[PDB]
Design a protein around this ligand. Sequence first.
Ligand SMILES: [Zn+2]
Ligand SMILES: [Zn+2]
Lengths: 208, 24, 49, 98, 194, 119, 219, 168
Amino acid sequence: DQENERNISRLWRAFRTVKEMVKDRGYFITQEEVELPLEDFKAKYCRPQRKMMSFQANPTEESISKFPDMGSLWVEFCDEPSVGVKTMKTFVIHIQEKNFQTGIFVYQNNITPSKLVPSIPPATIETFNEAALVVNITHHELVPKHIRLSSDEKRELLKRYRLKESQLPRIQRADPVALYLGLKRGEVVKIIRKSETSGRYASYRICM
Amino acid sequence: SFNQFVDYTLQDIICISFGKIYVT
Amino acid sequence: TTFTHCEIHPSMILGVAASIIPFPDHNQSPRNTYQSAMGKQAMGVFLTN
Amino acid sequence: SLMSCISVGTDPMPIITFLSEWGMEPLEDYVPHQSPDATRVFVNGVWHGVHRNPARLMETLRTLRRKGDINPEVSMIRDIREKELKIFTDAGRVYRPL
Amino acid sequence: LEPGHAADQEQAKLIRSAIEHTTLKSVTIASEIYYDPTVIPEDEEIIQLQQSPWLLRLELDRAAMNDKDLTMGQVGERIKQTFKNDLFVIWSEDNDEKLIIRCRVVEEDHMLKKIENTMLENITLRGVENIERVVMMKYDRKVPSPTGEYVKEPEWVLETDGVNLSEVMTVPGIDPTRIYTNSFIDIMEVLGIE
Amino acid sequence: TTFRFCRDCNNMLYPREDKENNRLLFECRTCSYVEEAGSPLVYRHELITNIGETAGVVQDIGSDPTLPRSDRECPKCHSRENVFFQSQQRRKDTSMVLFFVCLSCSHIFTSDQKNKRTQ
Amino acid sequence: KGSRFISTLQVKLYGREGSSARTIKATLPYIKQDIPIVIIFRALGIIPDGEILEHICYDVNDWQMLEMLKPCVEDGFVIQDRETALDFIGRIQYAKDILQKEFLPHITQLEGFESRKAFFLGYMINRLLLCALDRKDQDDRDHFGKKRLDLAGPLLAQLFKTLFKKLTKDIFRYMQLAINAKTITSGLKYALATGNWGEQKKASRAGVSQVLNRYTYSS
Amino acid sequence: DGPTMREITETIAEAKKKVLDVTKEAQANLLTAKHGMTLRESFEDNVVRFLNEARDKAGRLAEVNLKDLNNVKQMVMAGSKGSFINIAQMSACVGQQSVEGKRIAFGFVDRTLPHFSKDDYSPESKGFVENSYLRGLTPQEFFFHAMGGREGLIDTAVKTAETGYIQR
DNA sequence: ACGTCCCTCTCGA
RNA sequence: AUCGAGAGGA
Ligand SMILES: [Zn+2]
Ligand SMILES: [Zn+2]
């Protein structure tokens, strides 16, 4: 039985926060799906093997209102800690032949250049790591609630406050939360945080 | 410091041949 | 009592100026630092000629 | 401070000869593999020789300047814990009386 | 610490010695090499239960395996693991007279002295690195008692002397929705600019 | 390890093994001198240093007037006339246990009650 | 008592704790790289690697001191005799001059003293190691007994010597008494009058000849 | 002086005992190596808490001896100019003088002054000025008080050019 | 790579 | 007057 069960929790916990991100992005998951403990996780997924726990959630009916082009997201996992371009071609054709919109691929230890990620227009794919996904950053004491702005929510902020795109505080594409929502350049965001004075200050950020 | 300079260690700096030096 | 020498009088650690302070053993040390360089910017008979 | 004075510069030759005549072995005929308790002499940062029992050496000298045979500003010292003896005819030492 | 039993001194005692960063150099008191195809006197009873005649005999310290309380059965185990089956290693036991480990290579004079230092500094033991020391302590904290008001139940907190939050976040038994480090530059890299 | 050198070159000796008889030799790489080892101890590291914890305490050691004297007796002659000092292995951790030294018979003995030092 | 000599000597133990490359080398006046403490020992005259170790070790029982002296022997094992040592310092005999002259001259710069130059060198590598094995707290650069101070005499000594300096190379021009006499006077005058302690007219420890203070006899 | 100084002369003495215990107890290897800091720093960090609270809990015996008709007491009672540390340093005992954070250094041969024993960790030779400004420090006491203030002047004069480059 | 603000004297090419 | 060095004022 050894002490492999310590590596077993550190992927169920990842799995939950990996699926938690999918609801906050704008897809259809229930709280019972993520709160699925490891006891029910081993029974229906063991012998832990990752190519069985690849999911596909899809947008909610609220998300399709202000994000009407947010389409099919496919997410597949890998068993090999190291991944090369040979398995990436097997994954890219999942999204390519079925022509979905976005995809997130979880590698569990390492990937090499063999680089092909920005070559399926229109579909940029995010790549995350179970080392940083095991615990979710967005639950922390001092990480405020980032909210994605639409293309019309954008040009509405830029007209009401009489701005140009540059004149707005900025978040970067590699920002831990801009990954967590897959922010692209031009997308805005509405950081809503507690305030020692106002009680509820609402700052804004654009992404490059 | 000055007395021991002028008396001894001032003469030591004499190395067409220089000899004993007097200061008025 | 392994003494080798003995101090003449302890008041000789005082400097040129600060020797004139009345009872420096009853003052804060940074005050004795001021009167040290403050008796230097004073008035009086600096010479007889 | 008041009672402080400064060294002036003494000559080292009429004492490095007083060493060779009281138990100093120059270090050309010195190999430590027959004498490890070899104490080391120093004059102004110069290791000239070696002595065995510094007991009656550093005290025959400490009473040699106290009578005037050696200049009073020249400073003695032997570090017993480390078996070394440095002597300073230097010019620039700040000596106090006692 | 974790929400529930955060008033538990012992739950943090393991987390203290779970990220405090141990290495071989911490416990080893003397590392010796020998030529011995089974010579050394007091080692005859250990060997009881193809390689190379070059010995590597490192000896630990008594009190070293208490302050962080390591186990002889595991200190040598990750020495045994970090070189695959390429190093014939077997140790002593914890109730022994003196703790010692022996290794063979399976010319190689200095090339075993190669893994003399390699074992010392680059073979960690019990914890996550860069956290070069920790120390638990109690500090009071206000929290609402179920009756309604704010009240005075304290708790414990491990205070480190190093910052690699990147993977001290994910250790179990803590509160990874609360952990704080002074390194505001590291907080920005992990948790976001805001 | 306390190893030696060649007798013809006085150059240090680099060990080698007898691959046939299974013995250790101290080879020479200046000349071709060879000799077989005395002890199998070739290398020692010793990390927790203890050699020199009472370093430097030879002849006139009850003499240095800096070190005062204690009023406690020694384990042989039992003289209350004896000097003392802290560990002269000036490391950041070594305990303040004090290694007494006797003026009368010149032998080291600690006050450490947790153990009992010999040097 | 005859110069200034700005040529200092460095001897450093490479490799920190855990590094087995702890080679000891030495940087010397007028020589590029750091020479291993063995090559300079043979250019001296002490040849066999093993015979140099009595100059370093004053009790061949400090087995932990001799263990750091392993690789520096092998670091300079490629050179074996005195001739090969001083060529690596580069007809190419010129190293014997630099060793004899601008190197430990607080001993004498005459040749035949090649044994005090080595027994002092070993004593330095000796004291270097006691701090590496924490049997000695590194010396106190802010210790006052280690500090000297130049008063009027030695200050004038540097100035008088550096004035007589190019006076004698100006009388070497009276051939190709009617020599120059103003230069010794106007030089002493200048430094004591400006505060920038002489050095021709290029300033250099400025603020040493301060005007006196006459507000109170105490001051 | 009025029988209050008489009992401030025992807290200066009983607080020697509270550090006289940890004296020879620490050279018997009994000193519990506290969680982290070494044996040496565990003694310093445990002896200064006995000297700081010795200095402190020696002057607050005088803060009550002075009647409400005292002047310097009426000066701090309003807040015009005065603190409590001003009173203990002047009346009771000045206290441990500290250079660079810790107690005094051993710039000599493991000792503090060429008037004291070698390899000595005493408070009477590591910067505890036991006398008050009223009473009069001794040449040892006066000196340490000196090096405790050189640090201050060095600070409030050669660390007041960074405060002002931050502003710029 | 720059290294607090302003202000009072005094002296050598 | 100009530049260069020096001691001070809070
Ligand atoms: Zn040989
Ligand atoms: Zn005895």
